[model samples]
Target: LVHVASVEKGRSYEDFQKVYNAIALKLREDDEYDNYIGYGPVLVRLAWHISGTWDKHDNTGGSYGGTYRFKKEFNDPSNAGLQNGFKFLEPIHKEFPWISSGDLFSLGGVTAVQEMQGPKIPWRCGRVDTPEDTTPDNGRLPDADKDAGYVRTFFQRLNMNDREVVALMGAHALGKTHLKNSGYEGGGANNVFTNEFYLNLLNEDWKLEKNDANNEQWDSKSGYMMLPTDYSLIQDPKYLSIVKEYANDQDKFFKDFSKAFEKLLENGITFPKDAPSPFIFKTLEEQGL
Candidate 1:
């Protein structure tokens, strides 16, 4: 079923900015989570995973439905550790109950990215919550074990091209893959936002090994790991070129990442031309902390 975007009554840029501030402030105050890597990373992951369910083929599962609140999507094995991100937003939702689940989830990522000094991701609202039955079935998310071919084919369901796919995966720089969570481990910095993932991918002398969970992951002494799918970026010549491009130019990475992220979140929903332009929020740094 197609879902048309509609703004929350009387809510404008300021209303959503307020929501963004609430998430940002909590991100600052909750800096101890994930071993001091903080809530920023997982919140970004939560936003992506929620929106990643979209299938451009039929417009079935995108963030517009906010079905993650339902048990089916919430309990998907792929979303195992994301409960933390959801709970982090709980208080904010309690404070701003009018915002739709899709909006809050996507905005949390936008807030996390901007607050982490990543990029100014343009965001739009108006995703109304749908019933539980609207929740897309499990298994729509990508598998951790895959090659570049698989990665390319999988993302095509969402209409993401090679550059978009590589740009989106650069978010791996922000959060470690937990062994207990996704059977993968380690990430660059784990707190700071940068093209460090691509940097590490290009610079590190990686060793392929099987972790305790027996998943094949590339590891480096810098305390970093790359999923096979992530490794696929460099192995595939097409993705490798962009990986090199992003690794060398942080601004280019940020610019591409911001657009790709906004596209990922907005997939599968039709917006009226009269809908307000996407909001580019002020970072806490820009607002004098």
Candidate 2:
């Protein structure tokens, strides 16, 4: 049951950087996606959902297996809107046929983040594609309707601590939820990564309101929104401290998010002592392209 990190044959930093560039360039060219919010958010969410399936105790599902390619995982009720991310990556996968499904999917997230002006995320390669039967059943992803206790208990299954949970939820700043896909809806997308999610949670005059789907979410007069789980960060004193810390210290949030996110994507993965170091990619702007 041990899944070891296996670098793709003859691939190294240069090769993976090329793949990252391709994904980044497509993200730039495909500007019409999701009404110009672009594919950045969904791509990152794809990586999260794929990796989120992991159960720390059982080691059952994770990015290590690339099971999200399977129907059961792709069609999971929790994964509804991710098809756009999958389709966005289709041509990239075709051009770089050597990349494994897991690696490509995870890299899309990494590329999207950096291209959208987010912090640099160090990523490793070698997630072998497991068979269809290996896909984890649905419902492993977190629910947005719950409170702090629920959010705490839910992420515990993924082996994430309170700070890690707070850091990961910061991703809510990136993409809007579609009622069609997630039952939750009405978040404005901010493709650039920042500590705004924490700000919105702590500063917004939020009121509980039910949406068209009959789900309760916190809405602000400024047209921003928060899921109950997101608002829960401030509801619990311990999580509230982390939320305030991130909201007030942008550098601290970015640094902590980079560490937590890389850890999240790398969960259930074991890298060999001799394996290559995680690659920190140059942004497209940094490359002068």
Candidate 3:
């Protein structure tokens, strides 16, 4: 389970920075997808779904494997809508064929966040791709129908504590669930990354209802929705306090999310002390985009 760092051969900060720029530029040019939200949110989700498979105890099923390229992993029920993200990355892969799948997948998320005005996430390379045999089973992703307890317990496998879990969930602010894909609907704003997720969660007068897919979701007049797992944040006392804190402090949420996301992406991959320090790439704004 120990993965020694072997940075991508002949690759350095400049090379990865170029990859980052490609992802950012495509994100801006491809604005027609998902009703003009572009590919940003889905890329972030794809990154999480790839990394979320990690189990801290055994160090299996994480971004290190990059097994999502296989048929079985690509067809995972939990990954229904993620094909979009994968398809988006295909051309990038073609453009930079030398980049490892693991690096490209995780970097897609990092690029999306930074391009969307999120905090700078220091990223490191050296994730060697493994074979399909290394792919984790389909059910490792969390269920949206679950409650506070389930949400809390599920994250424990990834070694995320309360603060980290809450901060990671802040990502819900970015994407909306498609009923055709996930039996849920309307959590709009599908592009802009902000604390609007917490704001809506705390302020909305939510009503429980069954959608056509027979799934229960909290609906609001604002045309937004929250999964049972999302509502769990406000239901659990400890989680609720953090939720309110994030709801009130946008800066705090962004900062915390940057840390938690970096941890999540790096979960099961071991980096040698001598591994190059994480790279903080320039944002589109900083680059005068």
Q: Estimate the TM-score of every prediction.
A: 0.98, 0.98, 0.98
For model 2 the TM-score comes to: 0.98
lDDT of 2 by residue, 110-157 (tens): 898788778899999988988888889898998888889998998998
Clashing pairs in 3: none
- For model 3, the superposed segments whose C-alpha errors exceed 4 Å read none
For model 1, name the residue pairs that clash.
none
Quote the positional error of residue 42 for candidate 3 in Å. Answer: 0.4
Superposed on all Cα atoms, model 3 deviates from the true structure by an RMSD in Å of 0.9
Candidate 3 local lDDT, 1-289, one digit each (tens) = 8866579888899999889998999998989998888999999999999999898889989898789999888999999999999999999999999998988999999999988888788898998888878888899999999999999999999999999999999889886789888988876766777888888889999988898899999999878899999998999999999999999998999899999999998988888988899999997778887
Candidate 3 has its poorest 10 consecutive residues by lDDT at 185-194
Instruction: State how far residue 161 of model 2 sits from its true place (Å).
Output: 0.5
For residue 196, what is the lDDT in candidate 3? 84
Candidate 1's clash total is 0
**In candidate 2, how many Å is residue 12 off?**
0.6
lDDT score, candidate 3, position 94: 94
lDDT of 3: 0.90
| Worst-scoring 10-residue span by lDDT in model 1 | 184-193
